[PDB]
Symmetry: C5
Subunit: 205 residues, 5 copies
């Protein structure tokens, strides 16, 4: 429809793409996980596979508009390729992440963006003890691959992983699942890198 | 030939692409499933693999034309990349869906589109009981990834999955297969959501 | 060299792309299979894997030229991406077909095209009996995914599959292999649908 | 640097790409194999996997230049996608060939090109006897997919496969490995076809 | 923001891309490995799989700028596709390397670049003795595919692999891991090639 076509043209066809954040114009990315299932455990290679929805949110001044100028449109959906997205990645995957959903974002008129890719991830975890009452704990950090906390500030809205969509007939019972922001300085370099530590304790049903 | 070339140039090369539905101009997408086989059952990971044809229908005003101005052309085939297509996806897949057919659609002069991707899907299902007389029931929801019921309404022409192409020498006997529209709210979000729930009850033949 | 560059420019750069066949301007695609090996039999999932060359031939008026105008060039080779190709698809594959050869076609001055992709196909087949003297029969239909017989007709040059390149040390002996044009009529629709049925009867050697 | 940028611009931006060889202007491609390892043997499917470097060499008038006109530049490297490359392919692979290295060619001022991709190939071979003192022989032919001997002639610099890079701790001992030009006529076609027959005799070490 | 947009436009949009190093203008690439885990050992195929970060650094005059002309910007992140990158490859992989991180690099105003792809690599290694106290040693060389030491030289900052991020619950104990620059004259080629030899001695923990 007319007004939305006009809006997208104005936002995407008139200016160079947003080049990403810098120290002088940093960006906060909010990150949250919805765990769907632990789909595989391999005790011979120490690899565990998760399926989850990863919710990312950020806000750009360059994506703002006045709804009155565009037929009262307050938000729209658009391919994630049309916009800048943050390079948030798992620090200890063992295979390329697999994307399970369309790559499409929702942009709201205040310039906020929501992008929630469904993914299957293989990561490093020794599952020894998963077949016991105590279960086993695995952990994987997510964070920007090359932006420091001076450019991208990561945060969470809550430290509790969302389990309301966890598969009811999973081989595994989730004992706990938290997602915790950490600020780390690595030996080589003075700038902080932010991560969100996904920590899941589980056992066989 | 010349008339079809002209029609496609007018439909596709003269205006911005359709930007997708909105709350003001919502769209109805009709879904239908043709189940071909249950090709894998994994009781160690609770994953089941299906091969099916997914029929999708919708109608756009911007794809309409008068056959009289285009040599009586009443419909045409065109690459799916030339047109907007709905972001219908399975909500509980465990691996990227694999497409088995050419991505080509049929567009009719009244603006209606028919697109029928053949797919192999791995999804979450505990198959315990499949080797019994009672069998086992699996279920997977399909719906838009990013549009709520505000923008995309879904429906089925029938609640019965088409089994007329089900592989006659399958490992599995289909006891029942239904495709039902559901309306649902999620704790994550304020909008009504619409999905089509594919429910298949089956046993080893 | 110069004449061939000029010809390709005239054929591909100077006109809109051919929009494919229609009822008014139908096409005939000739199909022929060269079976190289039956490379896998899976009796747990009822899947069988074939490697073969699939020969496709058709003719377009828009690909004709007078050799006298182009230095006696009578044919040329070019990327299949440069030309329209028919959407011939296996109707019962269980995985995306894998292409084993370069996608390059031969175009002749009468407008005729020859394209012969080598492929690995997994398709639905219960191989029970393969280890017996009588062997087992598998079948898979190939046809246009989106076109009816009103736009694309199919034929074979011979109903006998070419076994002259069948792997001499294969695990399997081919007892018979045929490729037969078939017509399918559906209650819903006046237009006939065409396929070529590849039927292979085989046993362990 | 400046001189090289100018040369590449002159070679690749001012003329349409070379349209490949023809009967009038045929091309000789020289082929050589460097076998690194036999990395899998499957006696249940009769498939063997090789890892090797495949050296291809040819020469094009259109790639020539006077080094005196370009700052004494005598050769340069560029992405293989920048230039025409021959459609040399294994005739009996069972899976798409996997490329293990960058795809970059070396171009020399006399118009000669050298391109040496590292590859992993699965191909048809019954390995029965590999565990014996006699070993087993496998063979796979390589040649143009669409060009006859009238357009592309193949040759080797030597009949002996290069084993100087063969993995010192391979599971397999190479007893002989040859690469031999063959001219063949096929019933399918009236003109001669050229292949290089890679023949490897090996046993478990 | 505005200044970064201008910088990228000036660096990338205003001039031809860097055509890579030459004998007249050679380059030095610094390599460092951070070994995260030995994720698979296959004694039937002699293949071992590593997961590591590979840090690459180089410097280009054409990537320099004066921060005073660009709002004090001293560095920026950009897609690796925007810049030239060196063709550093493992010389003995058995499968295509899998990239685990976004392909993005950091460019600094002196023209230096830092690119750190995380990767999973399968490579040739007979792991016999891995299950002993002595352990086993594997090695894989990394170097330019097409540039000799006269065009691309390599160096490490240290000959010790960074083991600070090695998975604490790995199946394998690392006995030693070094990364050493080597110069090699291969019988195939008159100019020597430089590699960094990654040598890992390990055993089951
Ligand atoms: O020193 C490190 C190790 C640490 O490893 C976890 C993952 C990280 C994500 N990216 C990958 C490269 C890295 C980085 C950038 C600049 C200097 C050092 C450095 N790294 C990793 C680091 C974090 C942050 C960043
Ligand atoms: O937490 C959820 C689960 C629910 O799953 C079914 C599919 C949905 C379609 N889209 C996919 C992403 C989702 C959504 C957005 C923001 C936070 C959580 C979230 N999801 C899914 C949700 C619905 C609605 C929406
Ligand atoms: O009734 C069918 C089933 C059959 O399935 C195999 C594949 C086919 C390729 N396309 C997909 C849609 C289809 C078709 C068109 C019109 C009415 C029925 C109908 N189909 C499939 C059919 C063939 C032909 C065609
Ligand atoms: O236009 C179509 C194509 C599609 O093909 C897959 C199978 C289907 C199952 N049945 C077979 C006939 C069909 C149908 C009925 C009425 C008009 C069109 C039409 N078809 C197929 C269709 C689905 C649904 C239905
Ligand atoms: O019937 C054949 C088999 C033979 O197989 C080996 C490889 C060849 C290289 N290309 C691949 C396609 C082929 C060809 C073209 C047209 C009709 C049949 C046909 N083929 C192969 C043939 C040769 C020559 C040519
Ligand atoms: O024969 C070889 C083996 C050697 O292997 C290690 C890596 C090298 C880097 N590039 C990759 C291709 C190679 C080369 C070019 C032309 C003929 C043979 C050939 N190779 C490798 C060689 C070096 C140099 C060069």
């Amino acid at each position: 429809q007319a007004n939305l076509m006009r809006l997208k043209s104005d936002l995407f066809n008139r200016s160079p793409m947003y080049p990403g954040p810098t120290k002088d114009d940093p960006l906060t990315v909010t990150l949250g996980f919805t765990l769907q299932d632990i789909v595989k455990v391999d005790s011979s290679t120490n690899e565990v596979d998760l399926v989850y929805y990863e919710q990312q949110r950020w806000k750009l001044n360059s994506l703002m508009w006045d709804p009155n100028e565009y037929g009262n449109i307050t938000d729209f959906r658009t391919s994630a390729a049309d916009i800048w997205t943050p390079d948030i990645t798992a620090y200890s995957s063992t295979r390329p992440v697999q994307v399970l959903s369309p790559q499409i974002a929702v942009v709201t008129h205040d310039g906020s963006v929501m992008f929630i890719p469904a993914q299957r991830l293989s990561f490093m975890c020794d599952p020894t003890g998963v077949d016991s009452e105590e279960g086993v704990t695995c952990a994987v950090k997510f964070g920007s691959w090359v932006y420091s906390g001076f450019e991208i500030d990561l945060k969470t809205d809550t430290d509790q992983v969302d389990l309301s969509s966890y598969y009811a007939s999973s081989k595994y019972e989730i004992l706990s699942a938290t997602q915790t922001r950490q600020v780390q300085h690595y030996s080589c370099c003075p700038e902080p890198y932010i991560d969100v530590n996904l920590v899941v304790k589980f056992r066989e049903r």
